[PDB]
Amino acid sequence: ISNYINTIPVEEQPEYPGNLELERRIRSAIRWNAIMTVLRASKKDLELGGHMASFQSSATIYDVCFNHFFRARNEQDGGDLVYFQGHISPGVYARAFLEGRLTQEQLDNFRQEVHGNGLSSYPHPKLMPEFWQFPTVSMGLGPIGAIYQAKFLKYLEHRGLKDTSKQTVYAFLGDGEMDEPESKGAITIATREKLDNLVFVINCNLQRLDGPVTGNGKIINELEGIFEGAGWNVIKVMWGSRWDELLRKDTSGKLIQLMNETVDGDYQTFKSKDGAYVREHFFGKYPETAALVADWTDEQIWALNRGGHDPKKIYAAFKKAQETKGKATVILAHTIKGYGMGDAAMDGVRHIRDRFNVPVSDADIEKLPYITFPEGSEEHTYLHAQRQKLHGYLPSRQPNFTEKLELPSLQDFGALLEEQSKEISTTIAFVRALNVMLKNKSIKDRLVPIIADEARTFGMEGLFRQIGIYSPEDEKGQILQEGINELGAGCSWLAAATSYSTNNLPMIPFYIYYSMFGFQRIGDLCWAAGDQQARGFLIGGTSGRTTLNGEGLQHEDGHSHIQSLTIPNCISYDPAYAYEVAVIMHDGLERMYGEKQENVYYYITTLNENYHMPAMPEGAEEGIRKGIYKLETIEGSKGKVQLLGSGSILRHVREAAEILAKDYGVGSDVYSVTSFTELARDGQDCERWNMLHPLETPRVPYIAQVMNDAPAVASTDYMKLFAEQVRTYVPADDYRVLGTDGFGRSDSRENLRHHFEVDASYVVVAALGELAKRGEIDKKVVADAIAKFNIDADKVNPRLA
| Binding status of residue 181 toward a copy of itself by CB under 8 A | yes
Which residue's C-beta sits nearest to ligand TDK?
A: 174
- Give the nearer residue to Mg ion in terms of CB position, either 202 or 358: 202
Amino acid (one-letter) located at 54: S
| Binding status of residue 282 toward ligand TDK by CB under 6 A | no
- Within 360-379, the residues that bind a copy of itself by CB under 8 A are none
CA dihedral 461, 463, 469, 475 (to 10 degrees): 160
Judged by CB under 8 A, the residue of 398, 751, 776, 789 near a copy of itself is 751
Judged by CB under 6 A, the residue of 3, 106, 112, 138 near ligand TDK is 138
Q: What are the backbone angles phi and psi of residue 479, rounded to the nearest 5°?
A: -85, 135
What x/- string results for residues 28 through 67 when contact with a copy of itself is judged by CB under 8 A?
----------------x-xxxxx-----------------
466 appears as a binding residue in the annotation: no
| Binding status of residue 203 toward ligand TDK by CB under 6 A | yes
Judged by CB under 5 A, the residue of 79, 125, 174, 639 near Mg ion is 174
For residue 273, give every residue at least 6 positions away whose Cβ sits within 8 Å of its Cβ, in sequence order, or none. Answer: none
Judged by CB under 6 A, the residue of 40, 111, 208, 559 near ligand TDK is 208
- Residue 404 binding target from a copy of itself, ligand TDK, Mg ion, none, CB below 5 to 8 Å by type: none
Instruction: State the SS3 of 675-713.
Output: CHHHHHHHHHHHHHHHHHCCCCCCCCCHHHHCCCCCCEE
| 631, containing H or E segment | strand 628-634
Judged by CB under 8 A, the residue of 113, 157, 244, 250 near a copy of itself is 113
| Binding status of residue 517 toward a copy of itself by CB under 8 A | yes
| Binding status of residue 523 toward a copy of itself by CB under 8 A | yes
Q: What angle do CA 765, 766, 770 make, to 5 degrees?
A: 110
- Residue 225 binding target from Mg ion, a copy of itself, ligand TDK, none, CB below 5 to 8 Å by type: a copy of itself
Q: What angle do CA 316, 322, 326 make, to 5 degrees?
A: 130
For residue 285, give every residue at least 6 positions away whose Cβ sits within 8 Å of its Cβ, in sequence order, or none. Answer: 258
Burial of residue 609 (CB within 10 Å: 0-12, 13-18, 19+) is buried
* CB-based contact 507:499 (threshold 8 Å): yes
751 appears as a binding residue in the annotation: no
Burial of residue 529 (CB within 10 Å: 0-12, 13-18, 19+) is buried
Burial of residue 601 (CB within 10 Å: 0-12, 13-18, 19+) is buried
Judged by CB under 6 A, the stretch of 372-380, 449-457, 589-597, 725-733 that binds ligand TDK is 449-457
The whole-angstrom separation of Cα 496 and Cα 535 is 9
The whole-angstrom separation of Cα 4 and Cα 615 is 71
485 appears as a binding residue in the annotation: no
Judged by CB under 8 A, the residue of 210, 323, 347, 375 near a copy of itself is 210
- Give the nearer residue to ligand TDK in terms of CB position, either 207 or 426: 207
- Give the nearer residue to ligand TDK in terms of CB position, either 445 or 747: 747
- Within 195-224, the residues that bind Mg ion by CB under 5 A are 205, 207
Judged by CB under 8 A, the stretch of 292-300, 349-357, 386-394, 486-494 that binds a copy of itself is 486-494
For residue 706, count other CB atoms closer than 10 A to its CB.
20
For residue 287, give every residue at least 6 positions away whose Cβ sits within 8 Å of its Cβ, in sequence order, or none. Answer: none
Nearest distance in Å: CB 739, a copy of itself: 9
The whole-angstrom separation of Cα 401 and Cα 446 is 13
Nearest distance in Å: CB 570, a copy of itself: 11
For residue 216, count other CB atoms closer than 10 A to its CB.
9
- Residue 162 binding target from Mg ion, a copy of itself, ligand TDK, none, CB below 5 to 8 Å by type: none
What x/- string results for residues 703 through 722 when contact with a copy of itself is judged by CB under 8 A?
----------------xxx-
Judged by CB under 5 A, the residue of 176, 540, 711, 769 near Mg ion is 176
Judged by CB under 6 A, the residue of 118, 125, 174, 308 near ligand TDK is 174
* CB-based contact 656:629 (threshold 8 Å): no
For residue 513, give every residue at least 6 positions away whose Cβ sits within 8 Å of its Cβ, in sequence order, or none. Answer: 451, 452, 454, 486, 489, 539, 540, 541
Annotated binding site for Mg(2+): 175, 205, 207
- Summarize as ranges the residues that interact with ligand TDK (CB under 6 A): 54, 87, 137-139, 174-177, 203, 205, 207-209, 337, 453-454, 457, 484, 486, 514, 517, 551, 555
- Summarize as ranges the residues that interact with Mg ion (CB under 5 A): 174-176, 205, 207
